[PDB]
Amino acid sequence: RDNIQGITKPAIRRLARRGGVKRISGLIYEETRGVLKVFLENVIRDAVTYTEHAKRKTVTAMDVVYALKRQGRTLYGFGG
Amino acid sequence: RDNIQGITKPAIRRLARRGGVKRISGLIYEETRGVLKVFLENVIRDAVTYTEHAKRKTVTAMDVVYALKRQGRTLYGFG
Amino acid sequence: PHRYRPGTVALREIRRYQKSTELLIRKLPFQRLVREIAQDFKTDLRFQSSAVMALQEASEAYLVALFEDTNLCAIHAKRVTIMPKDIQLARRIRGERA
Amino acid sequence: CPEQDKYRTITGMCNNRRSPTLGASNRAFVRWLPAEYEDGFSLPYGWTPGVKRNGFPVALARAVSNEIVRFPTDQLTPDQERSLMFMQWGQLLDHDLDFTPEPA
Amino acid sequence: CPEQDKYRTITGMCNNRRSPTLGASNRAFVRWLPAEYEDGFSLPYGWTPGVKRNGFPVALARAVSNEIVRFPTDQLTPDQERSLMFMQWGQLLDHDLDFTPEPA
Amino acid sequence: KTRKESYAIYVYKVLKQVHPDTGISSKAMSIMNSFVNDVFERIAGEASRLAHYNKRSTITSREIQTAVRLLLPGELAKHAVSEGTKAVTKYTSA
Amino acid sequence: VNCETSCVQQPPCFPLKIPPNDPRIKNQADCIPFFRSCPACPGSNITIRNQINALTSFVDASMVYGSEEPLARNLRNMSNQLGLLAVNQRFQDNGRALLPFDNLHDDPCLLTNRSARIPCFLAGDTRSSEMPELTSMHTLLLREHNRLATELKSLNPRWDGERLYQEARKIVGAMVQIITYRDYLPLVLGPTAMRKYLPTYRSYNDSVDPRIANVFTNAFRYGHTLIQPFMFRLDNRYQPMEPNPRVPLSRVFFASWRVVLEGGIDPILRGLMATPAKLNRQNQIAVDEIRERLFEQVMRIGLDLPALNMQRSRDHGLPGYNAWRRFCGLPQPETVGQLGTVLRNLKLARKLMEQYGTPNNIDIWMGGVSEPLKRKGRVGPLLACIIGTQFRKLRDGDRFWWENEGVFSMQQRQALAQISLPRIICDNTGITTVSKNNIFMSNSYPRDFVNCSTLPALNLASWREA
Amino acid sequence: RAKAKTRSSRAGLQFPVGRVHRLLRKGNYAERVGAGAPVYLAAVLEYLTAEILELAGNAARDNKKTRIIPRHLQLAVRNDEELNKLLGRVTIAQGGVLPNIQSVLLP
Ligand SMILES: *[C@@H]1O[C@H](CO[C@@H]2O[C@@H](C)[C@@H](O)[C@@H](O)[C@@H]2O)[C@@H](O[C@@H]2O[C@H](CO)[C@@H](O[C@@H]3O[C@H](CO[C@H]4O[C@H](CO)[C@@H](O)[C@H](O)[C@@H]4O)[C@@H](O)[C@H](O[C@H]4O[C@H](CO)[C@@H](O)[C@H](O)[C@@H]4O)[C@@H]3O)[C@H](O)[C@H]2NC(C)=O)[C@H](O)[C@H]1NC(C)=O
Ligand code: HEM
Ligand code: HEM
Ligand SMILES: *[C@@H]1O[C@H](CO)[C@@H](O)[C@H](O)[C@H]1NC(C)=O
Ligand SMILES: *[C@@H]1O[C@H](CO)[C@@H](O)[C@H](O)[C@H]1NC(C)=O
Ligand SMILES: [Ca+2]
Ligand SMILES: [Cl-]
């Protein structure tokens, strides 16, 4: 159940490289994992609330889109 | 019409002191004046648009409140 | 010839202005600036006093928050002096100039 | 204290693995403020007659109950937002939490 | 104890008028954190061999002193901004403040 | 003179419920009215969007409860939900 | 030096002296019996006197299972391997379980009825035999544990007696915690104090001290202001139950024969559910049943419960009202005007000033119950602060908290979230009409009463092991 | 007819259930509005108002003041984590700022 370690150090390094980072400290990975967990917790909580209001057991992509729009992170290309 | 200089250096210093700033460089005042001018330009443009839509020649407090709320800067105390 | 240290009066002002609720900008110059700026959008404009007061309050709050962020940026760079690059970095990260 | 346990102990021990006696039974209370006795450590206020508390005489508890607590029963005010279940569960929870033994 | 005083009591009694014991001599220490004993209340860690603290064996104090504290004396460096008066006054103040008795 | 309605009487009643002796000023009333209007608008808009998403033409207590859960943070949402549920149950009983 | 019969102030006796012109006691030579609490370690002139807590501070239903190993072993049914608790071997409540009888040398239970000869009951706490409502609670929890063990034995035939007992005890403790922290404390403290002192649960601090504060044992006695002067019994239609529908409280103390021979615990539970409590007003604090006639039948003279509370606070050496106001971060009044402003009742401030002389000398219980109640609450700011702090420490400092990870599974936690005291009453008694949600608020029949069948039941399928 | 009884009195509230219902009906939120929605909304509004007013009154008492001014409202909002999160992008007029000086700037 320790799936937060599934976001490996090379993946975080790749994400930093896409962001234009040349050198990465060794303690960056834990901070990135914590930030990702917090963001995912917020978005997934909103999506699960939307799903529960609809009396559904399956979380759809449209619920995730609504959650992201609620946080102010409108996402294009998934759903509509 | 040079009224941006009406926001004097002591006023900017006071605003920084309220923000917890201890030491201020000499070139900060011009940057603060520019930032204030940009912010006021945006807010006043939105308020004047709201006023023109209402067919009025007077800018009211409600127009400014709506202009600020449109920018995610909700202001409490004027309606 | 009692002269305070170059940091004592600054801290005294910080403590004084963080405990008050007044407006730190003179009202008449700000009103003149607001009218001059509004002259660029519509000629022959009239302003309610409450409108100018609301604009002043919003501007002062925005500047205070920006200066707090700028102080954080300056402290990050191992400094106590507030510099324009700190303001620019804060505005970029906030999303204004970005 | 065992390294692994699935259930509580009856005596309440080993709940806090650093200080196992925290919360266990037959242990002294925790004082949030220093105690205030007549002589400082053991004698309660009102034990020795003529000794004042903070420059004022100590009022008898029965006298305080007579003057302040006493009120006519017929003027009782019912509670329209609470039931006797509230009070009964309060007493049950109190008997769950604390009990101060006295000599027989 | 007297309501009005001009000098300290040699024992420290009634310095705090609400709780006279506070600060007096021959009194127990205050606990900022709960005690952590081997058996919970009285036995120190390292008393009975084979008992581990926080899942780890208890290190001998002499072994820790030998490994970490020890250093060659000739490599001593002096403090340019302090004198032995500093540590002597520290010891004098410590002897002013506290002293834990031990049995004869 | 037209009649302008505001949440001043009700805010004063709540204040006297909480602080019978403490009074309020005019600017504090203005801020209270603005805050009440803003929260009302936020909750109503969230409930309307919830109703539109599920293809419903009616705003019910469920939509308001879900909007409260979505907007209000932490224990505020739980306490507000409990208060609203109690009020709705009391109204249904009476 | 017997304190119950002698008024000489010799340890451990600390008798209450009778003021002149007492309405009830006309002889000043008499006194109210009183026993000093046992010191933490007797005879020590070095340590400040401290009192002993004889029960586990955690909310673990120690009133049902006990806090000592011999008593806990004696409370169980060792004649089998179903992990049940001991029940009465002589009487039954309409075919349902009853608490076992307890053998003490000086039993006050037979003093109330010398004809019934029904002794006191045996439970996890020795105070369970006061008063039929508490005995009804203890019997209900006993029946609930037995039913839970029976259902678990049905689900898992491989489990032994010890496993059944431990699992049923775990479920009962989790139920008690849920009911306490979800239904009771919000009504006690109020939403403001509940949110201020009991925030959202996060995880298990091992650094939080879970011990019970000395002041808490006297601050939680605010419930003495909610006590009604009568015991009410209702029949199946929630009507007064003849004979004796309303019995004075002075005739129910230590009266287990009422529980045994007078229809069991169903009428008592119905009366608890369908009767309003007593409101705490600054001019109506405590009734005369507990103030003039407490334990009248089993004692040589009636006791005074508020006077006992304040004498116990003095015995425990607790600080005054101002010290605790300072402790909780509240302003401390100094004059009669400041005290009147704080209390919102000027006449009460004059009375308190006359009795004590300074706000610093006001006893903790008196000042706590004299304060105006919080909005949607039943305690003052000081009492709310103390109670909220104590329960926050008891919640965060408990390793076996039901919400703590590893204690219950996620499915088990969700199943436990559906429990309710109304459902327990429906399951473990013959009551078919039961009050709605927040049983501590519904008090008027039949406006806030529903049928027992509409209550969702606890689904134990998540406890099946495979 | 029978004597009129306000819906707020029936629900045990002090905020106007009828006014909230009218605002919901005329606010262009949905085609229809249920009968229990105004009660829930009024209860939530009353709870939030009571929370903020209680905190502001406590702040005013801490300052030895009898009346609540916008400074007390700002102190109440900014000192509460959940209220600060709710009113994060909200400016309160004449509210000032929380007294806070960075540690590194201290002598
Ligand atoms: C004279 O000093 C008094 C004591 O001073 C202490 O020692 C000195 C040397 C300093 O270090 C000082 O900071 C120490 O407090 C002082 O009275 C003190 O006042 C404070 C602030 O009001 C009180 O703290 C409050 O206590 C309660 C309970 O919380 C405490 O106790 C529980 C149980 O032990 C713990 O779990 C807590 O962590 C705390 O230890 C609360 O009411 C409160 O916290 C809540 O409230 C505040 C605002 O109301 C919020 O910010 C918090 O988040 C909480 O919601 C405070 O923690 C302190 O108890 C009290 N001490 C004593 C001994 O009574 C006094 O002010 C000084 N006099 C003058 C004139 O300056
Ligand atoms: C010539 C100097 C010193 C001598 C002979 C000395 C020796 C000792 C000894 C034998 C003990 C008791 C050992 C124990 O209980 O474990 C002790 C404890 C202690 N020392 Fe020192 N030490 C010296 C310097 C200092 C200094 C410089 C300080 C502080 C600045 C200090 C502070 C203390 C304190 C507070 C104690 C606690 C008393 C106790 O444990 O009973 N000492 N010292
Ligand atoms: C039939 C009901 C009750 C009886 C017989 C009773 C009687 C007593 C007596 C005689 C004491 C010892 C002296 C003292 O009051 O400090 C006591 C203590 C106590 N009471 Fe009550 N009271 C009752 C109701 C309540 C209620 C409703 C509550 C709480 C909601 C409560 C809470 C307490 C607590 C926590 C103690 C401390 C235990 C101790 O000191 O031994 N009681 N009770
Ligand atoms: C133990 O349980 C059995 C049924 O399994 C019951 O008949 C018996 O009376 C119980 N014994 C005691 C002492 O409660
Ligand atoms: C004592 O109990 C008996 C039943 O055993 C009952 O008839 C009698 O009335 C009781 N006495 C009193 C005084 O209640
Ligand atoms: Ca317990
Ligand atoms: Cl204490």
Q: What's the short story on this structure?
A:
The structure is cut from a larger assembly and holds 2 copies of chain A, 1 copy of chain C (about 100 residues), 2 copies of chain D (about 100 residues), 1 copy of chain F (about 90 residues), 1 copy of chain G (about 475 residues) and 1 copy of chain H (about 110 residues). Chain A has helices spanning about 10-20, 30-55, 60-70.
Architecture overview:
The structure is cut from a larger assembly and holds two copies of chain A, one copy of chain C (98 residues), two copies of chain D (104 residues), one copy of chain F (94 residues), one copy of chain G (466 residues) and one copy of chain H (107 residues). With 80 residues, chain A is an all-alpha fold. Helix content of chain A is 59%, strand content 0%. Chain C has four helices and two strands. Chain H has five helices and three strands. Chains in contact: A-F, B-C, B-F, B-H, C-H, D-E, D-G, E-G, F-G, F-H, G-H. The interface between D and G is large, with 82 and 136 residues. The PDB classes it as immune system.
List keywords for this structure.
part of a larger assembly; 8 chains; C: 98 residues; mainly alpha; Histone, subunit A; 4 helices; 4% strand; extended; H: 107 residues; 3 strands; binds a molecule of 6 linked components (NAG-NAG-BMA-MAN-MAN-FUC); binds protoporphyrin IX containing FE; binds 2-acetamido-2-deoxy-beta-D-glucopyranose; binds calcium ion; DNA binding (chain A); chromosome (chain A); structural constituent of chromatin (chain A)
Architecture (CATH level 2) name of chain C:
Orthogonal Bundle
Structural class by secondary-structure content of chain D: alpha+beta
> Which percent range fits the helix content of chain C?
55-70%
Q: Count of helical segments of chain D? A: 2
Secondary structure category of chain C: mainly alpha
Strand and helix order of chain C: HHEHEH
Give the radius of gyration of chain D: 21 Å
CATH topology of chain C: Histone, subunit A
Total strand segments of chain D:
2
Q: Please write the string of helix (H) and strand (E) elements of chain D.
A: EHEH
Shape of chain C: extended
Largest sheet of chain C: none
Spell out the CATH superfamily of chain C: Histone, subunit A
Q: Looking at the chains present, what oligomeric state does this protein adopt?
A: part of a larger assembly
Task: Please give the CATH class of chain C.
Answer: Mainly Alpha
Beta-strand portion of chain C reads under 5%
Biggest interface between protein chains, with counts per chain?
Answer: D-G, 82 and 136 residues
Modified residues (N6-butyryllysine) (chain B): 9, 22, 55, 57, 69
Modified residues (N6-acetyllysine) (chain B): 9, 37, 57, 69
Keywords (chain B): Acetylation, Chromosome, Citrullination, DNA-binding, Hydroxylation, Isopeptide bond, Methylation, Nucleosome core, Nucleus, Phosphoprotein, Ubl conjugation
Modified residues (N6-glutaryllysine) (chain B): 9, 37, 55, 57, 69
